[PDB]
Design a protein around this ligand. Structure first.
Ligand SMILES: NC(=O)C1=CN([C@@H]2O[C@H](COP(=O)(O)OP(=O)(O)OC[C@H]3O[C@@H](n4cnc5c(N)ncnc54)[C@H](OP(=O)(O)O)[C@@H]3O)[C@@H](O)[C@H]2O)C=CC1
Length: 271
């Protein structure tokens, strides 16, 4: 039962499930990354925010095949600053050419995300990075960057889980051939004890976590679940052995809530 992959509009391809690295210190980070790779993760996602790209870099040492994504933090937005930030990240990650680079937040009040996107466009044009995308962008922000550059992000990585399904934004992505990547895919773990999910889990002899990740997969979404537990890491990846049926998919669709968002709202975020 092979893992699936999602391909971008730019012709590049990304494993559909990856490891969300969080605020693990460098040293523990290397060992988590090494363990996850041993387990069969083919993709790792980190961010400058986390200050652990050195750890990820060391954990991926003999693993050039692993799809590597990182993100430019808010305080490095700007054309020249983003160029410098990308080159620093590539050094710390010990991968001269990264697979995906993302703007972490639009931060509209900063007024810098458009010039940041131009830097990413230049990084892609010059061959310094394979693919470029964004994170936490609303449709308006996507419109702005596409209008200014004519270059469409391959991915927008957004908070997405059964309580907050981002349906309207996904309709916009669809229209522009932008892939959706889900962060917080388990909604902090809250959904894992939901009865509706539990019933679907019993139905397939899988865990609630496995049901939820499979739901993201069946929606064509790239998913980066986070775990520090080797057992849960293994479990989260074991999701190519079953299929959620139409009834299941409808049942999860019904969980969407107007007040489901758990993280910052892009339009109002201040750090
Ligand atoms: N682009 C952005 O702005 C942001 C991106 N992110 C990304 O998304 C993630 C968000 O964090 P979080 O809400 O914790 O993410 P998730 O929705 O992936 O939930 C992870 C939590 O659930 C637990 N868990 C994972 N697998 C299982 C399982 N099989 N069974 C039971 N429990 C499980 C974990 O505990 P344990 O680790 O002990 O297994 C952890 O506490 C981070 O990895 C980060 O990379 C986060 C914030 C912002």
């Amino acid at each position: 039962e092979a893992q699936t992959v999602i391909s971008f509009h730019d012709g590049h391809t990304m494993p559909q499930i990856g490891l969300g690295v969080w605020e693990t210190p460098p040293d523990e980070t290397a060992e988590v990354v090494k363990e996850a790779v041993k387990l069969g993760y083919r993709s790792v996602d980190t961010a400058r925010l986390y200050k652990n790209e050195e750890g990820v870099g060391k954990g991926l040492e003999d693993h050039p095949e692993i799809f590597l994504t990182t993100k430019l933090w808010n305080d490095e937005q700007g054309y020249d600053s983003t160029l410098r930030a990308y080159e620093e990240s590539a050094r710390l990650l010990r991968r001269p050419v990264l697979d995906l680079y993302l703007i972490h937040w639009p931060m509209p009040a900063q007024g810098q995300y458009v010039e940041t996107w131009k830097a990413l466009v230049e990084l892609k044009k010059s061959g310094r990075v394979k693919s470029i995308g964004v994170s936490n962008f609303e449709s308006e922000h996507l419109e702005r960057i596409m209008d200014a550059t004519g270059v469409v992000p391959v991915v927008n990585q957004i908070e997405l889980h059964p309580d907050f399904q981002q349906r309207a934004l996904r309709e916009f992505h669809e229209k522009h051939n932008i892939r959706t990547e889900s962060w917080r895919p388990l909604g902090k773990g809250r959904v894992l004890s939901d009865e509706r999910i539990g019933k679907i889990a019993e139905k397939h002899s899988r865990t609630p976590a496995q049901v939820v990740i499979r739901w993201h997969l069946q929606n064509g979404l790239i998913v980066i679940p986070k775990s520090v537990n080797p057992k849960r890491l293994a479990e989260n990846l074991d999701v190519f052995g079953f299929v959620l049926d139409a009834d299941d998919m409808q049942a999860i669709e019904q969980m969407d809530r107007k007040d489901g968002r758990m993280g910052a709202d892009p339009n109002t975020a201040k750090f």
